[PDB]
Design a protein around this motif. Sequence first.
Motif, PDB file in Angstrom:
ATOM      1  N   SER A  97      15.619  -1.142  -8.866  1.00  0.00           N
ATOM      2  CA  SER A  97      14.217  -0.971  -8.496  1.00  0.00           C
ATOM      3  C   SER A  97      13.782   0.488  -8.576  1.00  0.00           C
ATOM      4  O   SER A  97      12.606   0.769  -8.833  1.00  0.00           O
ATOM      5  N   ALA A  98      14.708   1.423  -8.363  1.00  0.00           N
ATOM      6  CA  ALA A  98      14.375   2.841  -8.439  1.00  0.00           C
ATOM      7  C   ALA A  98      14.398   3.375  -9.866  1.00  0.00           C
ATOM      8  O   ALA A  98      13.665   4.321 -10.177  1.00  0.00           O
ATOM      9  N   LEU A  99      15.219   2.794 -10.741  1.00  0.00           N
ATOM     10  CA  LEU A  99      15.294   3.282 -12.114  1.00  0.00           C
ATOM     11  C   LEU A  99      14.078   2.856 -12.927  1.00  0.00           C
ATOM     12  O   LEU A  99      13.687   3.545 -13.877  1.00  0.00           O
ATOM     13  N   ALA A 100      13.465   1.726 -12.574  1.00  0.00           N
ATOM     14  CA  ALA A 100      12.335   1.231 -13.347  1.00  0.00           C
ATOM     15  C   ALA A 100      11.010   1.863 -12.937  1.00  0.00           C
ATOM     16  O   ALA A 100       9.961   1.414 -13.411  1.00  0.00           O
ATOM     17  N   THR A 101      11.029   2.880 -12.080  1.00  0.00           N
ATOM     18  CA  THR A 101       9.796   3.509 -11.637  1.00  0.00           C
ATOM     19  C   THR A 101       9.206   4.378 -12.747  1.00  0.00           C
ATOM     20  O   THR A 101       9.838   4.649 -13.770  1.00  0.00           O
ATOM     21  N   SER A 102       7.965   4.818 -12.528  1.00  0.00           N
ATOM     22  CA  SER A 102       7.295   5.682 -13.495  1.00  0.00           C
ATOM     23  C   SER A 102       7.819   7.111 -13.464  1.00  0.00           C
ATOM     24  O   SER A 102       7.545   7.878 -14.394  1.00  0.00           O
ATOM     25  N   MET A 103       8.562   7.488 -12.421  1.00  0.00           N
ATOM     26  CA  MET A 103       9.138   8.828 -12.367  1.00  0.00           C
ATOM     27  C   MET A 103      10.271   8.981 -13.375  1.00  0.00           C
ATOM     28  O   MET A 103      10.407  10.027 -14.020  1.00  0.00           O
ATOM     29  N   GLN A 108      14.668  -8.554 -13.367  1.00  0.00           N
ATOM     30  CA  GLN A 108      15.232  -8.585 -12.014  1.00  0.00           C
ATOM     31  C   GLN A 108      14.852  -7.359 -11.183  1.00  0.00           C
ATOM     32  O   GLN A 108      15.616  -6.927 -10.317  1.00  0.00           O
ATOM     33  N   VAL A 109      13.679  -6.787 -11.429  1.00  0.00           N
ATOM     34  CA  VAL A 109      13.208  -5.612 -10.702  1.00  0.00           C
ATOM     35  C   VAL A 109      12.243  -6.085  -9.622  1.00  0.00           C
ATOM     36  O   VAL A 109      11.098  -6.450  -9.912  1.00  0.00           O
ATOM     37  N   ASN A 110      12.705  -6.083  -8.371  1.00  0.00           N
ATOM     38  CA  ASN A 110      11.879  -6.413  -7.211  1.00  0.00           C
ATOM     39  C   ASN A 110      11.728  -5.176  -6.332  1.00  0.00           C
ATOM     40  O   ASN A 110      12.702  -4.714  -5.729  1.00  0.00           O
ATOM     41  N   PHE A 111      10.509  -4.648  -6.266  1.00  0.00           N
ATOM     42  CA  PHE A 111      10.185  -3.467  -5.464  1.00  0.00           C
ATOM     43  C   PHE A 111      10.197  -3.840  -3.986  1.00  0.00           C
ATOM     44  O   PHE A 111       9.239  -4.420  -3.471  1.00  0.00           O
ATOM     45  N   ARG A 112      11.285  -3.507  -3.293  1.00  0.00           N
ATOM     46  CA  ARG A 112      11.458  -3.891  -1.894  1.00  0.00           C
ATOM     47  C   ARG A 112      10.844  -2.817  -1.001  1.00  0.00           C
ATOM     48  O   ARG A 112      11.398  -1.721  -0.863  1.00  0.00           O
ATOM     49  N   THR A 113       9.700  -3.130  -0.395  1.00  0.00           N
ATOM     50  CA  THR A 113       9.039  -2.236   0.546  1.00  0.00           C
ATOM     51  C   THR A 113       9.649  -2.343   1.940  1.00  0.00           C
ATOM     52  O   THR A 113      10.169  -3.390   2.336  1.00  0.00           O
ATOM     53  N   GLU A 114       9.579  -1.239   2.682  1.00  0.00           N
ATOM     54  CA  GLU A 114      10.119  -1.197   4.036  1.00  0.00           C
ATOM     55  C   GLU A 114       9.264  -2.027   4.989  1.00  0.00           C
ATOM     56  O   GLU A 114       8.052  -2.171   4.812  1.00  0.00           O
ATOM     57  N   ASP A 115       9.915  -2.579   6.013  1.00  0.00           N
ATOM     58  CA  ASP A 115       9.224  -3.409   6.989  1.00  0.00           C
ATOM     59  C   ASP A 115       8.300  -2.574   7.873  1.00  0.00           C
ATOM     60  O   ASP A 115       8.483  -1.365   8.040  1.00  0.00           O
TER      61      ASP A 115
END
Lengths: 142, 684, 148, 187, 597, 262
Positions: free
Chosen positions: C24-30, B417-424
């Motif tokens: 989404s921030a915890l799964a980053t490479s950092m 459930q990890v969706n990288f939400r980029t800014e518009d």
Amino acid sequence: FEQQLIEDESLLRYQACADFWRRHCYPLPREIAQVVFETWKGPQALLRDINRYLQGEAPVIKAPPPDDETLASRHAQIVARIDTVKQQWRDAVGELDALIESSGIDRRKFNRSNQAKWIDKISAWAEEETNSYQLPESLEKF
Amino acid sequence: AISDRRARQSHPVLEAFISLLSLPDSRFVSEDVLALLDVPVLAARFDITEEGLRYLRQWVNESGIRWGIDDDNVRELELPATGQHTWRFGLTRMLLGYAMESAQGEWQSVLPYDESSGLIAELVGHLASLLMQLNIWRRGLAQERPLEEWLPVCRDMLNAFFLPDAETEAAMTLIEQQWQAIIAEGLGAQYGDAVPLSLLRDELAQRLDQERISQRFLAGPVNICTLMPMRSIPFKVVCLLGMNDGVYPRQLAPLGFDLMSQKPKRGDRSRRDDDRYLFLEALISAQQKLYISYIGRSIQDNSERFPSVLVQELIDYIGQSHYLPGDEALNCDESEARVKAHLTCLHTRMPFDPQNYQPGERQSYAREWLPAASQAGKAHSEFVQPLPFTLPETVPLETLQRFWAHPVRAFFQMRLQVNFRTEDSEIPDTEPFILEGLSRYQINQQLLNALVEQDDAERLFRRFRAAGDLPYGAFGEIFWETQCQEMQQLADRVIACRQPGQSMEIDLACNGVQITGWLPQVQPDGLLRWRPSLLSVAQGMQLWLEHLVYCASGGNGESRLFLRKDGEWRFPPLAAEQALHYLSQLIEGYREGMSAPLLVLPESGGAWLKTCYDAQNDAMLDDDSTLQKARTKFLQAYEGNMMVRGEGDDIWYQRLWRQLTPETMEAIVEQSQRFLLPLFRFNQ
Amino acid sequence: LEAQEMLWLLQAVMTPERENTLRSALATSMMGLNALDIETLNNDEHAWDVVVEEFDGYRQIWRKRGVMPMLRALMSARNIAENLLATAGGERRLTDILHISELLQEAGTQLESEHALVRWLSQHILEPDSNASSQQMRLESDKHLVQI
Amino acid sequence: QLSSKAADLFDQYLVYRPDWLAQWETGHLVEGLGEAQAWQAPLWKALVEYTHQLGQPRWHRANLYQRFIETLESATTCPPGLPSRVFICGISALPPVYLQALQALGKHIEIHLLFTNPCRYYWGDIKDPAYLAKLLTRQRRHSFEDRELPLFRDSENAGQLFNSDGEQDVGNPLLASWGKLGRDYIY
Amino acid sequence: AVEHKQLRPLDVQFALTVAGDEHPAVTLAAALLSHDAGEGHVCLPLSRLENNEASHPLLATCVSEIGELQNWEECLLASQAVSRGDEPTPMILCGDRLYLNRMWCNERTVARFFNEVNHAIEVDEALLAQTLDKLFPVSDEINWQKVAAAVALTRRISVISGGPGTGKTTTVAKLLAALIQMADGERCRIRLAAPTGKAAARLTESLGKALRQLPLTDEQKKRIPEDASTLHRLLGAQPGSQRLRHHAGNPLHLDVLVVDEASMIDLPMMSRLIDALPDHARVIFLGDRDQLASVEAGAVLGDICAYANAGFTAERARQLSRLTGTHVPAGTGTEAASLRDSLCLLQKSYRFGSDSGIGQLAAAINRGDKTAVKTVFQQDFTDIEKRLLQSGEDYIAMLEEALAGYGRYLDLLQARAEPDLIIQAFNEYQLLCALREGPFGVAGLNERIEQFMQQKRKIHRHPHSRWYEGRPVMIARNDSALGLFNGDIGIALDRGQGTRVWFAMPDGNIKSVQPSRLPEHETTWAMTVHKSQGSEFDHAALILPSQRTPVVTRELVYTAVTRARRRLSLYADERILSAAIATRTERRSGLAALFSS
Amino acid sequence: AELNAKTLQRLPGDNWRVTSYSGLQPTLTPHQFPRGASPGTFLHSLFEDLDFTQPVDPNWVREKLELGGFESQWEPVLTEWITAVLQAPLNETGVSLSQLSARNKQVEMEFYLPISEPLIASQLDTLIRQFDPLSAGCPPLEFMQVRGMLKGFIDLVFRHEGRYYLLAYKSNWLGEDSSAYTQQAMAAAMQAHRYDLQYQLYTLALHRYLRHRIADYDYEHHFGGVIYLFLRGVDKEHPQQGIYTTRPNAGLIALMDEMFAG
């Protein structure tokens, strides 16, 4: 006594190029704006062309155009120059007196047919390549 | 405690008032107005909330508002009146969308804006309440007024644009105090002529930043302050920073026409002599310890930065007046250089360097970087881990389509459930002169859907021109003509073999797995799909999955997809056994992709396969030239050129690996040979 | 990518209530966590509660003390600097993270609001313009490298 | 901008150079100045007429200090309202006009000047050998020890230390290179 | 009205942009139409524009033509902004009522959906009567639930009108049981829709506890409705764009659709639901006729169920008598037989009868105010109490009675008991206020109650913690990840692991959430009547402000009365209670004229 | 190779801070005056700049309202209110403000008070409650051990018939419009805002100033009391309303000086 130095000058240059494209390319009719679109897609291509001359010392243009010649006068001049050649082709059509060479194939009359459908209107700007077959310096070498 | 700094009390009040004083000189760009609405005072004046600002962001972004408050503002700048892409055009568009639905059409060559329809468009009535005020003072601050008329101007601006609050009361009081002080100093000389607005604006901007703070100079915490002349206080530890050349001593050039600089006297004061006397008082006032630090090496190009002349004379007098007991009688210049090298402590460039934590003379007190400097930490383990996953009974076709559209994305955004939400994207500063990207693709899609029914292209042209999405004048007509030519050339192939077909149901049982779904527009000839895109492997995989799910339950017929530039994906009809076998293979690939990340690249893997595949003999070539051309195609499709975005430039692939190793490349090649082989095997 | 990871971390710090941005921030490479760690974090409610509590503490430090104290407490509690120094090829990433932190601290003093710095960071991510301060520096000086 | 820069220069002339403004009020030039005086002498005087044309008072800082010195030297009784003692502490830079006013102020009311100097001997300049003998005759005395102490380290060789122009050869290069303001202030 | 005179800037800018250089009559008409659209009125009658405007002669002197433009229709049609329905104009004038183009389009869509598409599905009457006899045990007299289920399974589009506490969910369960028992071999993809997520959760728990009671089969338990979805989730609404997934092209693949609580369905949501339905789906609407109006502009369920008072048709009465086997009365006259046949009215309430004063007060609310005064007056029915609130001593008495109401909650809070009994004691007493701020509102009553708990030794509160033990919070935004919806109450207390907020799930359990995990939190000692819809409280206390406001009307007092289960208290003036009953929130719409022809 | 970091043994510094008292804590009428910090400072500057001997000029009040930015209609009511303040005497004998010459008055005396002991709140509040009668309620404030200097700004110090007196200005007074500002309400405001510690520190500073300046000084002979002047509470018919005169027990000052000294 006090002034503010700016590091980047590209933003004001692009703004002035957009203002020039607004005040020059918007009121053009279709027959001129077609050629303007064929030269450049927008003001970005014009800025990419003239960015080496807008900065620094302004260069001197060899043989500049006169100050009273606009885009419409040049367009009408080129239209009349094309129409004179079209009239001279329409008058001297229907004859063949040159000698047939080994390099010159006998399909050239089909190229004359390609020049028969070309003289319809003067709304276009690009002539046919078959006029390169109608050169005396190329026909003499053939 | 930091003293002698510039007094910064409220930036978004003073800066907003300065921007409001530059109101006639402003271009009224949409970003400068959304920045004015970012102030909570101006938003609370016109009853605009933060949610209303968030709605107005996308409303200005989609309504086609770029620059120009009014048509008279466009005519003021010696520009032709376009009539569109202005604030009035966007206001009329939003009001027509509040009044009329977008499906009705244009009214005054203005297409309505179907988003703002309910009570939230009341916030539009707030925004039209703002810009009209931004008109009135635009006509107010342009004319030049004498000093007797500039008295109530700032007060009326403050009570018009701003609302009094508890926090921002002192800022408005300081604005009124400085304005009335400037007008009182002007009227003390009884100035009769007119005074322009920009002079008073620059004077207020200079007077507002003049204030300094020195309250906590000797509170008890350690003092941080600049060198102030005629102030020498004895301290135990005196530290000096920024003693490099050029910065200190601070040089102030004379005016040139001053007569005191020509013939100097005894009582004349200069800043250079004041700085030298400040350095002398800092040397004398130090009781116990004197610390001096200067930038010696550049952080950009590692260039040697020489110190000031005062520090150089100090170290020269130190080297010529003292000597070390190690070299008692060696030389004069060599002992001086040894003293100056012993005093000079060249510290490291980075704080995590192990040289600083070495025990000796100097040792760092930063315990947070001590395990970082010890190099005794564990490395980053791999993100790929075997997870337990049980394949359910009923797996829908939409899940398989979302899996085979992007397998790594389906492993990321559905399993964990990890969706990288980029800014518009931000609002552009100018009107669109060209059509490229998503807008051109949507225009081509709507034009192809209009020309597939032989509808009026001129009506869709007027609909797209009424919204401002097309370029103004003849260039929009040329773009619409060439796009209509291309879509007519595509439609002459599309409707050449089109039959009326309806959507059918799909209910399959394969390997004990139920697949339920719907297939739209199933004609008796087979499957017919058309998209205005290029020849890609993802659309071929989607069409192959639809052909497998269509041929498994009846449906004898071909499957065809028509792309641009005479691109066509065709699959012949197959039997039920081969279709069920390939569907079970895709289900096994889906259940492998949910447990482990299935490294099947569609584009680069398909390019490698179609470089290595031979459709004539149904066998893969093994010569060195094909093995080099497949690597070339894989490196071309993974990382593209400087004009086409490659497949490797993606947020889902950079999380797994940072650099494309050849082992993972061979793994992707093997997975593409295992899975993407029936794509090119049944292609015709 | 480190600027986008710092943007995701600042968006998770500013809004720690919604679990989507934090996940989404915890799964980053950092952060550097495996997929099993993310699965156990989604399964265990108490570990996610501890993560939300420590991110609320990071938000309190960021609202009270500033940018660099919050970033230093995050790099000291998670111990991500030692893990990036232990990983081969992560020293350039650590220097880029430190330079992004220095630029965010330099841009955070001129701004009053907390979301304004996040909007400035997203704008400078969207603006690839090259300034003299915002360029990439040399990663290491002690180890000799072939200089192109 | 020109008016602000000329007003700053006129304020510096009001502080430091009252004689130039006193000669510009009459209309006469000063021999040995720059070219800008050719536009600076008529600019100041027309200023003095302009405040003479309006209701503003005439008196300023430059024309008042000489009358302030003379009315204190010519008076017999002390004027009321003056404070008992004035302290000047932490100040190492003053114009000669302010010191000439403070000398006439100190003839009547005791003024204590606390000056911080890094050297204990005389480290300033000299004007004339007749001023060198006057400085040699002047001797300091301690506050608690009450013993007379000389200024120079050598009284017989004090003339050899100064140059022909009047500058003392300071042995310490840091004091000679950094303390020019204090060197003028002690003189 | 008072608010209708104070013009919004939206209406003024709309009148200045649409009319522009035209006559001021068109400007005034556009401003009045925009103000009535902002207030919630769908249509604008020209009689109110002609009679109730002082500038009507002035604009009659403004226009100058051959015919002088004496009529408002000619003056509107002369401009380019008003047409008769052919030109793409913002304003539409068709039946001497001016509306906007979107409102006219949605009104014509609703009239087409409720006048033309509603046909009669002819099924077997014998098996339907057998299933109604085997499901409903009562067959001695007329039962409205059996007739409602018969007329919902008979026709395609049916509206079931009934109040709270009348056994609506039991009727829905019997309807679904007879629906599955009627079509055995035919598959039925039953779908459930709700306007809010909290009402969807209540519908799911109600149908879960209702459908397991009735005896089913192994194929019948497979066709149990899985979940109830929101109307924004069923149609596929996006946050950025307003584009739906099932807008016009692909309809939702459903067999029967039960939409609960249609009183909170506005006109645009109804029109978006209508365009998504196929030509074979059967829709069953639920809700009360006299309930509160919709959120945005429009009144769909009220204008639909206004014709339920006329009755059925002469043929439909005999059809219902043949189906149910009882005596069904017939309605006099015939105006719209399809809509009058598709409707039904539930009057027999099961959770409260004529012995309880709550139902009598709800029946007297729709009547005159003197009937409500007589209902409260004689003997109070041991259910309704009236306390006069005029001065500060009455405010202190009201706070003392709220302390007496929250006595069991504070007793379970101070004794350090389980949080489930604490939430169950808190869910018995509730204050209902009209406004939000000021001395009469949400945050005012909340701050006064917090100050009173600081005064008397009932609740210990730290000034800097903001998370003291015993504060009631409520969520403002939906959160499906945490399981809490908008309008759900939580109680913050210390179980021993720290200060956490306990929420009462509809499944019967309690969930302890961190206060840092809450997206929104507002003090809920007194709820608004608009935000308390769907919930139920045992002891309710209405507090009305002394200031005259258009919010306090007949429907607000009706929803405040029906919010209470058993006990209801009132704190208001007599003149405000007399004026709120007579002033009914009427919304002018074209449905009264479109359904009449 | 192995490397380590040195660790600091103790705290870097004690709680040394130079703080103040705030760090340790019909249509036109003065009742209808806008209550705020900026109007309070405006009235404080009006009472500071105005001379007490000379009669109040209306054009000066109009100029001060033009400089401040208030309404011009308030000016003719404000100046007579100022004269109503000036006509009201504030003393135990009935001494008005017009009898004070320019040499007797001193406006805005800034003082620095040293303290070398750690200021314990429990050892100080009990010493205050031992002598001050207003400390019956008022549960004690909590503050850290403050060692160093204390700043203070006394509004007015004036002598009369050989006796020194202090005067401070409080002008917020938002909650009173009627004549209810009696001595009980002023004592309740002093107990709520905790101005007793400020007045005690003012008495200590004035005692130390008169001891350092005047030789042969006695606290009972020279000091007379501290006057607090509430501006919105001054009435023409009530001389006692608006003013608040307090005298210490002359035993708390010596113990407080011994505590602050060491």
